[PDB]
Design a protein around this ligand. Structure first.
Ligand SMILES: CCc1nn(CCO)c(CC)c1Oc1cc(C#N)cc(C#N)c1
Lengths: 557, 412
């Protein structure tokens, strides 16, 4: 059918007019197919013959699907699409199974010949003009135009969507306790009614839809659980990921590892513990797709650990709006975090992992906070509410960090859970200068042209040292200088730098870095018993800084 | 009750806003649906089709002394693409000098004036749904929308008529309109002041707008807090070094600053804890600088062609410092914010309070909101700001990593 729904007024982009793309001369066979295909469509009101007036045209083509000798009609709307107004956006997200509410009875109804059952604005049809060419550019071809939403046109997905929304509205009002999910041409229906009433409610729905030009499958034609939906396997009381097969292979290509990471990240939705970090590392620099990449000992271990996890089929439960959501997070390793969300202890609605920030100097407290934030966002999207957190960090550790950190931070309602490895700060800078501790005045310089540099210090105990560095930057020398002072100092130290850069890094109590150097410094800071770090403006009559600036600057301009 | 609509126009080349809707809680979605289905019945808004490619974000807030959900539309994009907002509202310089200023929400007035038919499209917004089960509920405005700077610009004519009697009766009272609010300042005793506000609400009442003893500001008692120089008997190298740094920095703002005498004390590689007696010379320089820091700042002047910028620092113990300038260091205003009894455990809560306070002051002083540099993670702010937000307006903001020194310079 063709829905009796009021049409959506459509228009071309402001300073633009309809397409006028000439018809390529087509094969005798392809021309025959188009004629019959179009005759059928015309008979169903999908298209209509047009006068010579209409100056618009869009190319037409014909292709046959194999294992069958049945032709298909392809229209190239690339041009019309460039000229068509921008529309809204069908949806801002895809439903996640974990968000699906528990309902005794569920039915899937797909809207049949979707796009073709919806009318197109009459004032716009003129722009959908296409021509079946005559055997060898004989004379005028048979000219048609669409009356319905053309397959592959810009506004079809959005217009169909709206039409369905308008159609479903009255039924929604009269049946507030029934869930209907609109997804493309599909339609999923859920209720807490016993079959009987539900099949009746379904039938009533279909009748309302049919009364509006939309065909659906009848009982015996409806799909049965499990439902294989957009990568998922849906059962009435549980869900999981579509059967994942980890390819047993000797020699892996970039493409193979890419697909592997993909399936793994995908499986991470329900399978807890999946680690992908070591595999991603191999995908650095890549340069090729068919190039084979040898697996590191670490990747082989990671892959093996993943296999074990995937050997045992895991399932997810559905959402109960009456119960609270609980999210638990655990540290898997170096910058690796996993979480799980449930309502009833250990009956997971969903799983996930977190492993961001490319080592831009961070600690476990910052990471945990980031993971909490990420989880919070997805919970709002999926369930419309934030979960209660179970964190492997002491309230004391948390308060100490937050109160003293420069950035405003805030975790929703959480509770400590003794699940090792626990999150903690590995070292802490002193609040005031240490009495009876050597004071190192450090500094570093680097020549912009030569990339050569010097790093060193001078103490109050009269000590001195100056190292020469190759292929360095000002930043690296400043950090080198601090590293030097930490190496030659012992348990208690006061360090005075002129680098806001280094002060910034160290103050944030990092425990991980992409910089081998910063790691040296961290490793060294952990060993100390007491460390005080102060800053002074450079190029001033400031005793100490004024002097290190000499030996470090000499020979390096 | 339609009238002759004011034809609105986007900037040449500029196109309507296409800003994504951020996920909202079920609680807020429920509230917005209830509010919107009611505004639709009243003809203020109407459903729209997919042929409307525009979108503006929407949220749900609750003002102070209010337990009823309110709709807050984030028109920041549309506002930037409008002006028009052409015929603006002049900012009175007398407002910042009043003994007291009262803020009154007059947003309910805008729903009387119909919006230009050809502009309506640009006011489109979406009510999202949980787990994207349902496609968003789409609407657009038929009347002047709250939050759009075009509404007060258009409503000026009617606002001046409403206020004419009250104005002639109290020609010493200053009335400033900014977005959905009215700023009313007088030098009257608090008693008369409040009495005059009550009278003003009656005038507004006669025009259908119930304008509810609102937030009371005292711009007189606003004094730019200095940079603060310590006051100790004995000083260490560390203290002088901490002082030299602080002054070295401040010297970039206040020209009259000197540091040569103090720096003379810091010579040789001494231990940080070593006590150092200050020379009588350094004593003067120090005292002399403190005097400079008491007074404003010579050279800085508000330039109406340039944007206002506000930086905030977390000081700890519920304390926050902030600075307003148009060009870095050239501080037009500096201040402080201390957590009010309740937020005893929330950084985001305190930061949103501080932002609103600073924004309010900017409106009073310059009649413009500053662009904020927020010491927080975007996603965190994005997730929580609406939880404690109570203003009808929304300033522009960006997220930054506070330079550790800056905290000290402004530390109190
Ligand atoms: C109300 C729709 C619905 N609820 N539940 C939870 C049952 O307790 C399920 C699992 C079977 C549904 O079915 C879908 C089937 C397909 C398919 N094919 C897709 C989606 C979605 N989203 C949902």
């Amino acid at each position: 059918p063709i829905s009796p729904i009021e049409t959506v007024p459509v228009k071309l982009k402001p300073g633009m007019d309809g397409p006028k793309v000439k018809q390529w001369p087509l094969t005798e066979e392809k021309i025959k197919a188009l004629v019959e295909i179009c005759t059928e469509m015309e008979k169903e009101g999908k298209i209509s013959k047009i006068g010579p007036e209409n100056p618009y045209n869009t190319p037409v083509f014909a292709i046959k699907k194999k294992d069958s000798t049945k032709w298909r009609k392809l229209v190239d709307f690339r041009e019309l699409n460039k000229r068509t107004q921008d529309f809204w956006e069908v949806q801002l997200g895809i439903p996640h199974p974990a968000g699906l509410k528990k309902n005794k009875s569920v039915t899937v109804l797909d809207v049949g010949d979707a796009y073709f059952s919806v009318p197109l604005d009459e004032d716009f049809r003129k722009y959908t003009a296409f021509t079946i060419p005559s055997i060898n550019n004989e004379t005028p071809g048979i000219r048609y135009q669409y009356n319905v939403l053309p397959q592959g046109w810009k506004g079809s997905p959005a217009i169909f969507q709206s039409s369905m929304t308008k159609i479903l509205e009255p039924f929604r009002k009269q049946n507030p306790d029934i869930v209907i999910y609109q997804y493309m041409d599909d339609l999923y229906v859920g209720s807490d009614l016993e079959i009987g009433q539900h099949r009746t409610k379904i039938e009533e729905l279909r009748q309302h839809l049919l009364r509006w030009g939309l065909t659906t499958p009848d009982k015996k034609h409806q799909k049965e659980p499990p439902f294989l939906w957009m990568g998922y396997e849906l059962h009435p009381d549980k869900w999981t990921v579509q059967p994942i097969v980890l390819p047993e292979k000797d020699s892996w290509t970039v493409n193979d590892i890419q697909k592997l990471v993909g399936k793994l990240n995908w499986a991470s939705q329900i399978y807890p513990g999946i680690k992908v970090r070591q595999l991603c590392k191999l995908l650095r620099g890549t340069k090729a797709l068919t190039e084979v990449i040898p697996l590191t000992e670490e990747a082989e271990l990671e892959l093996a650990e993943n296999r074990e996890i995937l050997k045992e089929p895991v399932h997810g439960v559905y959402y109960d709006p009456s119960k609270d959501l609980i999210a638990e997070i655990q540290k898997q390793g170096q910058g690796q975090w996993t979480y799980q969300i449930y309502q009833e202890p250990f009956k997971n609605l969903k799983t996930g992992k977190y492993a961001r920030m490319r080592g831009a100097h961070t600690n476990d407290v910052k990471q945990l906070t980031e993971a909490v934030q990420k989880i919070t966002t997805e919970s709002i999207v999926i369930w419309g509410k934030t979960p209660k957190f179970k964190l492997p960090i002491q309230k004391e550790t948390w308060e100490t960090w937050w109160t003293e950190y420069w950035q405003a931070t805030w975790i929703p309602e959480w509770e400590f859970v003794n699940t090792p490895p626990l999150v903690k700060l590995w070292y802490q800078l002193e609040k005031e200068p240490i009495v009876g501790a050597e004071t190192f005045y450090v500094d570093g310089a680097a020549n912009r042209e030569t990339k050569l540099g010097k790093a060193g210090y001078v103490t109050n105990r009269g000590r001195q040292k100056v190292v020469t560095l190759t292929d360095t930057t000002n930043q690296k020398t400043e950090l080198q200088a601090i590293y030097l002072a930490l190496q030659d100092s012992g348990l208690e130290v006061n360090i005075v730098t002129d680098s806001q850069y280094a002060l910034g890094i160290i103050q944030a109590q990092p425990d991980q870095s992409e910089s081998e150097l910063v790691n040296q410094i961290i490793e060294q800071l952990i060993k100390k018993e007491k460390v005080y770090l102060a800053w002074v403006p450079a190029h001033k009559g400031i005793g100490g800084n004024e002097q290190v600036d000499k030996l470090v600057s000499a020979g390096i301009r | 009750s339609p009238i002759e609509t004011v034809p609105v126009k986007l900037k040449p080349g500029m196109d309507g806003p296409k800003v994504k809707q951020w996920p909202l809680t079920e609680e807020k979605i429920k509230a917005l649906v209830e509010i919107c289905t009611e505004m639709e019945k009243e003809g203020k808004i109407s459903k729209i089709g997919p042929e409307n490619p525009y979108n503006t974000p929407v949220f749900a807030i609750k003002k102070k002394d209010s337990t009823k959900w309110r709709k807050l539309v984030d028109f920041r994009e549309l506002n930037k693409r409008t002006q028009d907002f052409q015929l603006g509202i002049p900012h009175p310089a007398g407002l910042k000098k009043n003994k007291s200023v009262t803020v009154l929400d007059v947003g309910d007035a805008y729903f009387s004036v119909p919006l230009d038919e050809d502009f309506r499209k640009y006011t489109a917004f979406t009510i999202p749904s949980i787990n994207n089960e349902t496609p968003g509920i789409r609407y657009q405005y038929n009347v002047l929308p709250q939050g759009w700077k075009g509404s007060p610009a258009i409503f000026q004519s009617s606002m001046t008529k409403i206020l004419e009697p009250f104005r002639k009766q109290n020609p010493d009272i200053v009335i400033y309109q900014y977005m959905d609010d009215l700023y009313v300042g007088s030098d009257l005793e608090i008693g008369q002041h409040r009495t005059k506000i009550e009278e003003l609400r009656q005038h507004l009442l006669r025009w259908g707008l119930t304008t509810p003893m609102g937030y009371e500001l005292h711009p007189d008692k606003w004094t730019v807090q200095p940079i603060v120089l310590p006051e100790k008997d004995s000083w260490t190298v560390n203290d002088i070094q901490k002082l030299v740094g602080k002054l070295n920095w401040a010297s970039q703002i206040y020209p009259g600053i000197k540091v040569r005498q103090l720096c003379k004390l810091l010579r040789g590689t001494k231990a940080l804890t070593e006590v150092i007696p200050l020379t009588e010379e350094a004593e003067l320089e120090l005292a002399e600088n403190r005097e400079i820091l008491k007074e404003p700042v010579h050279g800085v002047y508000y330039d109406p062609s340039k944007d206002l910028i506000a930086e905030i620092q977390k000081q700890g113990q519920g304390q926050w410092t902030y600075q307003i300038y148009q060009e870095p260091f050239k501080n037009l205003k500096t201040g402080k914010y201390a957590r009010m009894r309740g937020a005893h455990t929330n950084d985001v809560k305190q930061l949103t309070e501080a932002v609103q306070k600073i924004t309010t002051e900017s409106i009073v002083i310059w009649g413009k909101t500053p662009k904020f540099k927020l010491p927080i993670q975007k996603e965190t702010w994005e997730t929580w700001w609406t939880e404690y937000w109570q203003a009808t307006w929304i300033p522009e903001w960006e997220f930054v990593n506070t330079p550790p020194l800056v905290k000290l310079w402004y530390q109190l």
